[PDB]
Design a protein around this ligand. Structure first.
Ligand SMILES: Nc1ncnc2c1ncn2[C@@H]1O[C@H](COP(=O)(O)OP(=O)(O)OP(=O)(O)O)[C@@H](O)[C@H]1O
Ligand SMILES: [Mg+2]
Ligand SMILES: [Mn+2]
Ligand SMILES: [Xe]
Length: 527
């Protein structure tokens, strides 16, 4: 608000302050014909501005650091103490990084965006974002919850995010850091600092990481999931790692969207942390994903897409990155929950995975113990298939130990009588990905209760119950062995994958409860 207020954060000599920039002002800022470099936007024929995020086209987990002090020492899940990105940082080194950012933002025109993280007043964070790049302010205006005029009048930040993308750290070698870039958090000062990377989602996932610290410590599940609700009031959540289908599949014309990536689950039900959605656009098909496509219009913000001279978008071009994205406020989707993005208790819990090994079934109904086993496992794979095991389908954002997320999620699911399903949105023996059309039909059958009491057969080794039939889907692909020339091709790959699961899960077996969950995992006692 005032330059004296900004000085309290360490930022000096600010000549122009743009508080709560409007969408109209951000549009004209991005398209200012005198901008240079990665600040510049271009207007597409869809009416949305597109930007280039620079050398970073994704988050940088290797540059993530958390100050280790008496607030975080005994509560945080530290990288140096299972695998995670919560690397410890000294208070002294933090002060050096803070000097870099605050000096970079001193003497600049700054955008200040006030917003909320969390749909519920009783648990939301009030966050103040400070940046010198208009499209970064636009990103957080889209992705966080935009306060009302009454809420702005009494706004009191709980957390400050200072984005110094244009600065770098010359001392990183002597400070033992990964690179000249940094994404750093201090829970004593309640601040996030960013240097070197311009990428906007460091701010979203920085605050998600903070919600992931606070909410489970007070009994509230904090979840990397999309969520929607049917006309009957039945709520579903969709967990999964990146590219597995949370945004694609939750944006469903038969359902009201609650949110697409970050939710809590408290005594009243499931609630969104965010005010927008962050869709993948590589090979985007208007026919397959019409709601996402039709959200790409003025006030959406396209990232890293190829824009031709005539202003048309080549959505198929990944030569800068396969991670092309668009952010938009959530009301760019027609059928959403409003005026607050929340609903009741989830009764369907769907774990999405993209299995590049071609082993897992398109749909399995999970036992209670299998639900815990596969939630802690957090599997997906990419094309030679390369596995990722990321606890809770989102280990990059966990600030507490994985079992603390599992414990509170189990409590919420048991109290609501929820049923869980494992859905392979990836590959089978055809070497092709299951179609969006078939996957949507599988989701329909989960959501309408088709599968809750359906007859099943059991997949060997993983011991997964698979429905014998499903409306709208070719029965043949329900059994993953059927898309190989022989069940023998499937067995070889299944044993490889089972061994990966078993090795990965070992770390959890030093508690009685974790040891007991081994029996719910894949079983392999030869080779
Ligand atoms: N059968 C399928 N189901 C879901 N998505 C599919 C399928 N086949 C291809 N896709 C594509 O896979 C990608 C799914 O990405 P999506 O944006 O839903 O990931 P996400 O789970 O939301 O990840 P993030 O957490 O990174 O946002 C999209 O590009 C989508 O078009
Ligand atoms: Mg998504
Ligand atoms: Mn995500
Ligand atoms: Xe779980």
């Amino acid at each position: 608000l005032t330059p004296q207020e900004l000085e309290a954060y360490g930022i000096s000599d600010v000549h122009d302050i743009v508080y709560n920039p409007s969408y109209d002002l951000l549009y004209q800022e991005e398209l200012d014909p005198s901008l240079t470099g990665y600040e510049r936007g271009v207007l597409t024929n869809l009416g949305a501005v597109a930007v280039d995020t620079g050398i970073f086209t994704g988050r940088s987990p290797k540059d993530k650091y958390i100050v280790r002090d008496d607030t975080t020492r005994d509560t945080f899940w530290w990288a140096d103490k299972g695998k995670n990105d919560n690397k410890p940082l000294s208070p002294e080194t933090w002060q050096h990084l803070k000097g870099l950012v605050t000096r970079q933002l001193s003497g600049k025109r700054l955008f200040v965006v006030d917003a909320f993280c969390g749909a519920n007043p009783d648990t939301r964070l009030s966050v103040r974002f400070i940046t010198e790049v208009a499209w970064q302010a636009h990103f957080v205006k889209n992705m966080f919850i935009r306060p009302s005029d009454e809420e702005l009048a009494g706004f009191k930040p709980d957390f400050i995010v200072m984005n110094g993308a244009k600065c770098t750290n010359p001392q990183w070698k002597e400070q033992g850091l990964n690179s000249e870039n940094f994404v750093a958090f201090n829970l004593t000062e309640r601040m996030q600092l960013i240097g070197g990377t311009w990428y906007g989602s460091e701010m979203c996932k920085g605050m998600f990481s903070m919600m992931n610290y606070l909410l489970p410590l007070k009994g509230i599940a904090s979840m990397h999931c999309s969520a929607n609700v049917g006309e009957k009031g039945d709520v579903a959540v969709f967990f999964g790692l990146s590219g597995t289908g949370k945004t694609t599949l939750s944006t469903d014309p038969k359902r009201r969207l609650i949110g697409d990536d970050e939710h809590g689950w408290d005594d009243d039900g499931v609630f969104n942390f965010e005010g927008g959605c962050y869709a993948k656009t590589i090979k985007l098909s208007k026919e397959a994903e019409p709601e996402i496509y039709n959200a790409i219009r003025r006030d959406a913000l396209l990232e890293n897409v190829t824009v031709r001279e005539d202003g048309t978008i080549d959505f198929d071009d990944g030569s800068k990155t396969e991670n092309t994205r668009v952010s938009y406020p959530i009301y760019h989707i027609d059928n959403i929950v409003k005026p607050v993005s929340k609903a009741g208790h989830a009764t369907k819990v769907i774990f999405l995975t993209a299995d590049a090994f071609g082993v897992l079934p398109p749909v399995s109904r999970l036992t209670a113990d299998q639900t815990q086993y596969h939630f802690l496992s957090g599997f997906t794979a990419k094309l030679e298939p390369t596995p990722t095991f990321s606890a809770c389908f989102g280990a990059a954002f966990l600030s507490l130990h994985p079992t603390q997320y599992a414990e509170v999620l189990v409590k919420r699911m048991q109290a609501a009588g929820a049923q869980a399903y494992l859905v392979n949105t990836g590959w089978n023996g055809t070497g092709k990905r299951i179609s969006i059309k078939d996957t949507r039909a599988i989701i329909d059958a989960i959501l309408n209760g088709s599968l809750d009491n359906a007859e099943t057969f059991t997949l060997p080794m993983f011991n997964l119950a698979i429905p014998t039939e499903l409306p709208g889907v070719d029965t043949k692909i329900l059994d993953p062995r059927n898309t190989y020339a022989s069940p023998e091709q499937w067995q070889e790959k299944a044993e490889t994958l089972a061994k990966l699961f078993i090795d990965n899960f070992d770390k959890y077996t030093d508690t009685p409860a974790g040891a007991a969950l081994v029996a719910a995992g894949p079983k392999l006692h030869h080779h």
